[PDB]
Amino acid sequence: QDWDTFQKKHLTDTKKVKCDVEMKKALFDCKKTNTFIFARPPRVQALCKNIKNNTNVLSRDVFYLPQCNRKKLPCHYRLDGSTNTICLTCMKELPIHFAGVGKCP
Numbered sequence: 001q002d003w004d005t006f007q008k009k010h011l012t013d014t015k016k017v018k019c020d021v022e023m024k025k026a027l028f029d030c031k032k033t034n035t036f037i038f039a040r041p042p043r044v045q046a047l048c049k050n051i052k053n054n055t056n057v058l059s060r061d062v063f064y065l066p067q068c069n070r071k072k073l074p075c076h077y078r079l080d081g082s083t084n085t086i087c088l089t090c091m092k093e094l095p096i097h098f099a100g101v102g103k104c105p
């Protein structure tokens, strides 16, 4: 919804995210899946430069994507990872939504 919320739930400083610990936070509320992006805010923010408001952008470069997928109720997860391009929704040249992986919707 905003740059601040986007960072909190989609950017990570480590490849080994503690899913069971993170996902229980109110931001995630034990949702089925959440994909993290291993990168600093600057690199991610730059993807939205010169992008029309409320439109998506597909990155040219790849990122490692730590992903938490729920395996057992109510909040138990398995950590999965892969590498791929990311689709972000921009607003005022700032990412506010994680739109897709590999391509845009």
Ligand SMILES: Nc1ccn([C@@H]2O[C@H](CO)[C@@H](O)[C@H]2OP(=O)(O)OC[C@H]2O[C@@H](n3cnc4c(=O)[nH]c(N)nc43)[C@H](O)[C@@H]2O)c(=O)n1
Pocket (backbone or CB within 6 Å): 033, 034, 035, 036, 067, 069, 098, 099, 100, 101, 102, 103
């Ligand atoms: N909404 C979803 C979520 C997960 N999945 C897939 O279900 C598997 C786990 O059982 C994962 O490996 C996913 O494949 P995937 O290639 O990681 O993701 C496919 C699509 O899912 C959406 N998705 C993934 N992570 C996120 C996330 O954190 N947020 C949002 N909004 N969408 C996400 C994107 O639209 C992406 O292109 C899906 O098809 N749709």
